[PDB]
Subunit: 301 residues, 6 copies
């Protein structure tokens, strides 16, 4: 039976093989990405029974997504190729670090997602349903879907996990704020970064007061992070490693924290776990390439 279920829009990442401006490259590497996706994979790699829900176009890129998911062991009960196209994007990491991103996903088969996108009973018996603030920002359908989705998970005694992920590209801090204030009630687990808190509540302080979910984790760059449960605030291990491709650590981290919880581990181990994931993906090129496999933890144990 599935332990975790996530949902979102899959995207294909195109990335240069080395730092520098995209304008100058002539060879791009192809990777499969998408927050929720990055997360499903990570979990899948750790032995967690997880299912992904989403759509992709009936194009070669869609096929690729599917193969990849299927290969990783993700449950695609409610995932399929549909008329339309698959969203993709181009990335570029500058020498001194200033990255920039370009999207080509508006109107993709995957950005459809509307309430009822799958059969709710799917959620039954499941531990968690994870989502990203990116999905609801795509379209009003999605927005609705999202609300609908956790509503249903709640209704089924399924824990709702949410990684804020504010994309200025998709919407305003006000809209984002509006969304959250409407959504928070149904959230049990929330993932957030400092910038995001600052950028939407002025200070990482107010944000906490406002968004007081049962459990909230705050990513704080390389300064570890803090977990907030039972009025308690455990701090996580900070990491002195340099980013290779920090483009998916955020998701890896969450996944990591998720796996811990799914295994009913003390907040300390969950964090520990989460950085471990984040670290690994950050240390590798690709959205979720670098995500470790269960047997790795085992040896590392």
């Amino acid at each position: 039976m599935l332990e975790v279920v996530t949902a979102g829009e899959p995207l294909v990442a195109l990335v240069p093989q080395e730092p520098g401006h995209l304008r100058g490259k002539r060879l791009l590497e192809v990777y499969v990405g998408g927050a929720e996706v990055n997360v499903a994979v990570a979990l899948a790699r750790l032995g967690v029974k997880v299912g992904f829900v989403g759509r992709v176009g009936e194009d070669e890129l869609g096929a690729m997504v599917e193969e990849r998911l299927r290969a990783e062991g993700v449950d695609l009960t409610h995932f399929r190729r549909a008329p339309g196209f698959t969203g993709l994007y181009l990335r570029e990491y500058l020498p001194l670090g200033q990255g920039r991103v370009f999207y080509y996903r508006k109107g993709s088969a995957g950005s459809a997602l509307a309430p009822g996108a799958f059969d709710p009973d799917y959620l039954e018996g499941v531990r968690f349903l994870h989502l990203s603030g990116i999905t609801p920002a795509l379209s009003p359908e999605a927005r609705a879907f999202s609300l609908w989705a956790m509503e249903e998970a709640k209704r089924r005694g399924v824990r709702v996990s949410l990684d804020v992920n504010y994309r200025q590209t998709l919407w305003s801090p006000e809209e984002a704020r509006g969304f959250l204030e409407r959504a928070l009630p149904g959230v049990d687990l929330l993932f957030l970064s400092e910038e995001e808190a600052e950028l939407l509540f002025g200070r990482v302080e107010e944000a906490l007061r406002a968004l007081s979910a049962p459990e909230v984790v705050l990513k704080r760059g390389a300064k570890g992070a803090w977990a907030f449960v039972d009025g308690r605030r455990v701090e996580g291990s900070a990491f002195a490693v340099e980013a290779v491709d920090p483009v998916g650590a955020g998701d890896a981290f969450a996944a990591g924290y998720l796996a811990g919880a799914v295994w009913g581990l003390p907040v300390e181990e969950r964090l520990r776990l989460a950085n471990l994931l984040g670290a690994s993906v950050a240390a590798s090129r690709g959205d979720h390439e670098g995500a470790p496999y269960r047997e790795d933890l085992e040896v590392l144990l």
Copy 2:
């Protein structure tokens, strides 16, 4: 002074390094393409003073187009990066030959092109203005632009060359038909393929009766081609070479025929020339990679 002026939407081609389904590749080569573009380059490579008109987004891909054009020696007097994005596409050539294409260009800065896109006086003194049936199919703006453009060329005693290039993706054979019937009057030189004639007039025969422009050249796959001028019909050299990447020979050919004319060469040499170009580009990976340089003809002479 410019001898030739072409206009269209530039696109960035992404192509696998070897036959096979895109879904399986993980490394894509980056090339600059776009019918009119492919043509401007070819000519440029041959010593022809040519100018390109069009727009691209203010993105790294746009920058790339520009560098490439600039490097080739194309006149960019009326070419520039503008707000928006640059259109791109992914290609894939199957083992047995069934290729398939995926676009990501709708709404691109380059698909804007509306009448007056540049200063008409530019056209002055110019020998030819070349266009592709792809441009007017992009948007009504373009459609209008096209008409406008040759109108202006005509008005300036500039020869109008047109490569049909019917894209089913952009529109219907009816619309295409409608366009042509309205445009033909102002065409002096027309490039056409058998399938296109068949696909829009039932037979390569009727098409000829209907579209009787001063000079018409019919591409007939590897069976050479025929030139129609002065009620005469010269046949061109057929070529027994195998295609590597036939994705731009059509343009190369045209360019080739154009260079010939610009040099006031007998229809025989123009054809000869045209196949030569087509052959070379077809024998090379990339949209217009393979286009020979003037000094090459010289040695080949």
Copy 3:
């Protein structure tokens, strides 16, 4: 429900990117191979519901096999990683064509395969069970397994297909002969090459008299091939294409013929089909890379 079930030892192919002696290369491409495997994939790619049975080590190479199979859509109900290692091999194609192969598979987790390796009921309702003469040559366990396996398929009204594939490396023509004579009784469909018939019966003639299975297909290099059913002998289309990497066409072919039969097609179409597969894989680098997908036939139709 599964239409086809195959079983064998998966192997990882390491191959230079271009002709020449392995001793000189410094970059090897990694491919997944193994007769039965190559076949399962081909079918899988064609829409056929097929399942693979076998084992691989608990190593990164094993993981790779699995991902690949899983991605292709193969049923792995009775496939898994087990203690031990994964067999692999290095290939090398010489300029003038003299290839040579090096194995590193003896004692691999995959070469275990003993009778009962999976639950026989799996076979139920299945059309065919395919095997290669390579498997029984690996070990006495395998040898036994093989016999056991078709015994069970027979017992379930499942058609037994066998591709001889004599490997001198594994055993002698006598042993091979011994095996066949003991196995033929249970074979409904047999795939064979001229050299193999010559090499084990003196002449491609005697081999036929001796190994008279309900249906036998003889691969005859580029001279087409012959099908023997109902005392009839249809000849297949010969192919004038040059081999790129002929290392798996043999399997592709079989798969091709299998798909045809599974679809209940006239022997003529099955052959036609088979060469088509063989040709495509032969025209591509990699063991089964080049295997076409169902939708390809469709366009080709």
Copy 4:
């Protein structure tokens, strides 16, 4: 109108894709380089109207230089291919850092450069004329040219900028010294490194006393640098970044400082700017690959 004009000998760099001895590599990357060139590009990339003066052979490598310059937007009014060959060089960066260089430029079309190499009126209205101590070291022609050149710039109210760049390969510290003492009078802006000062004046102290130009900037490795204007000595930001390919930062830096001045920015910003450039190029493979573009500063602003 041109804001900056530089002149020198263009060279083609050949570099291994990774650290190690050249003797062991078998694949070399091709880059366009040459102090003055590296600088023209950098500026060009920043929006500065700059022109380059120099010669290259009538070879494929020359053509390459030209394409590259042309693509970057450099004014080639007085740049052209001429009989002869194009200078090139091979580089190699060792694991522990000990690099070594090999030249193949003696007698190149580009090392000709003699007084009058271009029309002086070109210089008119221009802000600065930049040169490197490498040029005059090439040949007595060049040496003369150099003197001639700034003489002419002076004569036109054009600021003379000079990056010492002592190459032991080309000449002795005495000759270098001799040159400078003869040239300094006409220099308004001088770029220098500590080693060079030490290596030619014993101490970075004496060098300053001796070479007291209106404005002098001293590169001091990663310890920032110092600017000397109006008896004042501003210090620049030191940078804690590791060199990827420090082979052109020196030029990038200068360019950077130049752009600042051209924009009439306070010495502080000029430095800031200069390190920024240097840093970026140093963080990238290639002579001037890594040089940022104007719109980058903008975002970085």
Copy 5:
């Protein structure tokens, strides 16, 4: 005349081009390795007359080993291809550093090595005979060979150098211990790492008391190392460099220390030398790629 002679089993390393799990790679680089081999090369590169003794299969990989050795200048008087196969192995370096290795060498032509494997007179006049604790761990033949070998070197006034190199894969700490206690008497020079001392004597302290050879060097990670001669304990330069591929530094180091001794240099220089080697190889991909050449020291001098 040979100054140094080493002996062991050559192996072919297969390594991914970048960090990550082997299961995910699809391109592996081919390198020649094997402790003793890595060492012979290093020395060879430094101008030291050294000879290698060992066997490899009559396969393409064997040929490769030979070419490589031959190219490096190693004396192969008693080295040859013999029936059988060549051992090889696959490596994989994880993002966070946890490497893992996979062997395919059991039963290789090279693991034969039995007493008398070569003519003892070879050893005559030689300075040192170097060995690794890996060889005797391969097989009882080898084990015997080893003992035999230094016995013979001793008998010829040849210094015996031994790099412990405990491989848990080959045997137990007890067996290893047993071996050493039996071998130490004939050792003049011993190389050891902290872990190994800890892992076989509880503490790096006891190990020293137990294994008191004339000269013993203890590798201590990046904390330099200590040399033990004449009741004295010189400490070596610690190195603040990050490992690229630390897979052969251990050997490089030893070689380095060997070259020093062969040149009769003070222990200080020998260490200095040794780290230098280790550092260089560690800073490069490949088993012994990165090993510097004599003329490099010269420039570095």
Copy 6:
């Protein structure tokens, strides 16, 4: 004992990975070349004991030559790195076939070669001494050396083989002519191409009358070739294979013919042999890459 001895200047070839103008490439492959060198290797690969004589600079490229030669099994008794640099060149193969070459070898350590370059006794007992018309064209030293060299071979009963190889780049048809007329007397075996005969004697007919050496072989493109011995004229097998990189077949061929003779084979087999070599190298990228190994002939036998 050496069977063959050749001498010349080694050069490093830099070549694009695919057809097209060098100006556009950005990645060049590194190969070791040089007529005589190409030949020594070929022979070496065939089991022939051959020695090479020549010099290279004390640079990383020189080192490379040496490793390569050494790895191939060539006798370097009289080969060494000397002060100076190593000659190199860049190649480029155009789509339609018009290749062009660029040298950077004038004044190289290797172009020194003067009479007495090695000890004549080396030649003793040797079957043949092979040379190319390229060497004497390099410098008057070389020119003298050449004469000197065969003089010495003659004096030692060593057969003199010469491959004309007229390089217009090095000298005039007159000088070439002058050289030959002075050298022919001492030639026993001469290799020549039609163009060369035409280009230096008007007709392939006169050339034969003029240059009547004991044995002369005329390369005639793909139309086989003719051997002239004992007033007889055997014709060789023509080859219907397409050139990949025809840049060294000429040498391969010669080598091939040489091996035959060294093995005392009938002129028919020598030719047969020669085309075989030429074909193989022509079918491969690189100067002599593609040269087959003895064991290959064996299988091919």
